[PDB]
């Protein structure tokens, strides 16, 4: 069984630009070691596209870190996410007529 | 120098960030053998574009809440409210002088 196919799929999940030009058989030398495989199976079967951020998000968070603002981690992150998900419904904000009033 | 440095950074990124177990951890010789050849760059991608789930949720929530807060529309609404505050304060002060 070509074990490098799952690695190719995983590297396609992380949005690698050159992952389409990489073959599974060209990286079969990676998967031939047992100590290699101990990390390779977990990387293939426990990493998805949700663990990966885009370049725009990365540079925006870099500018945010350079801005010195506190980073929402833990409870503040959960509070912000809960407020945004509750605001994902019908919200009457951003009205330009009340702005004109 | 880049091979061993990338191998050690990859090991630290596997341990600290993803929480890779010790039995599933890549040893130093494993990281050196993976990173030689074409593996020096692609895992160099993974250490800078791939994070843990908690870190990705952290960055996404931080951006999606602060950019909502730092929108110029929110700023113009806030400064119009502050303008209303300054205006009736000016009303009180001018009426006091009157």
CA angle A60/B48/B20 to nearest 5° reads 125
CA distance A41 to A37: 6
**C-beta atoms of A33 and B51 within 8 A:** no
CA atoms within 13 A on the CB side of B15: 13
CA distance B53 to B62: 14
Pair B49, A15: CB distance under 8 Å: yes
| Method of structure determination | cryo-EM
CA distance A82 to B61: 10
**Does B18 contact chain A (CB < 8 Å)?**
yes
DSSP per residue, chain B? -HHHHHHHHHHHHHHHTS---STT---HHHHHHHHSTTHHHHHHHHHHHB--HHHHHHHHHHHHHHHHHT-HHHHHHHHHHHHHHHHHHHHHHHHHH-
CA A100 to chain centre: 40
Residues forming beta bridges with residue A52, ordered by sequence position: B50
Minimum CA–CA partner of A13 in chain B: B50
Question: Of A19, A61, A10, A6, which is closest to residue B67 (Cα–Cα)?
Answer: A61
Pair A14, B56: CB distance under 8 Å: no
Pair A84, B68: CB distance under 8 Å: yes
Resolution for this model in angstroms, one decimal place?
A: 8.0
DSSP per residue, A54-78? -HHHHHHHHHHHHHTPPP--THHHH
For chain B positions 21-80, those within 8 Å of chain A (CB to CB) are: 21, 23-27, 29-30, 33-34, 38-39, 42, 45-46, 48-53, 56-68, 73, 76-77, 80
CA distance A101 to A80: 29
């Amino acid at each position: 069984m070509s074990c490098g196919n799952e690695f190719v799929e995983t590297l396609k999940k992380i949005g690698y630009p050159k992952a389409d030009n990489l073959n599974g058989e060209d990286f079969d030398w990676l998967f031939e070691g047992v100590e290699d495989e101990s990390f390779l199976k977990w990387f293939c079967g426990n990493v998805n596209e949700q663990n990966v951020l885009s370049e725009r998000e990365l540079e925006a968070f870099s500018i945010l870190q350079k801005s010195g603002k506190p980073i929402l981690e833990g409870a503040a992150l959960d509070e912000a996410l809960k407020t945004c998900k509750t605001s994902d419904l019908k919200t009457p904000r951003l009205d330009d007529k009340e702005l004109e009033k | 120098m880049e091979l061993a440095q990338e191998a050690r950074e990859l090991g630290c990124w596997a341990v600290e960030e993803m929480g890779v177990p010790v039995a599933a951890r890549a040893p130093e010789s494993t990281l050196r053998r993976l990173c030689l050849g074409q593996g020096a760059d692609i895992w160099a991608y993974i250490l800078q574009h791939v994070h843990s789930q908690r870190t990705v949720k952290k960055i996404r929530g931080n951006l999606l809440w602060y950019g909502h807060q730092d929108s110029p529309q929110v700023r113009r609404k806030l400064e119009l409210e502050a303008a209303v505050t300054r205006l009736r304060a000016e009303i009180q002060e001018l009426d006091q002088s009157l």
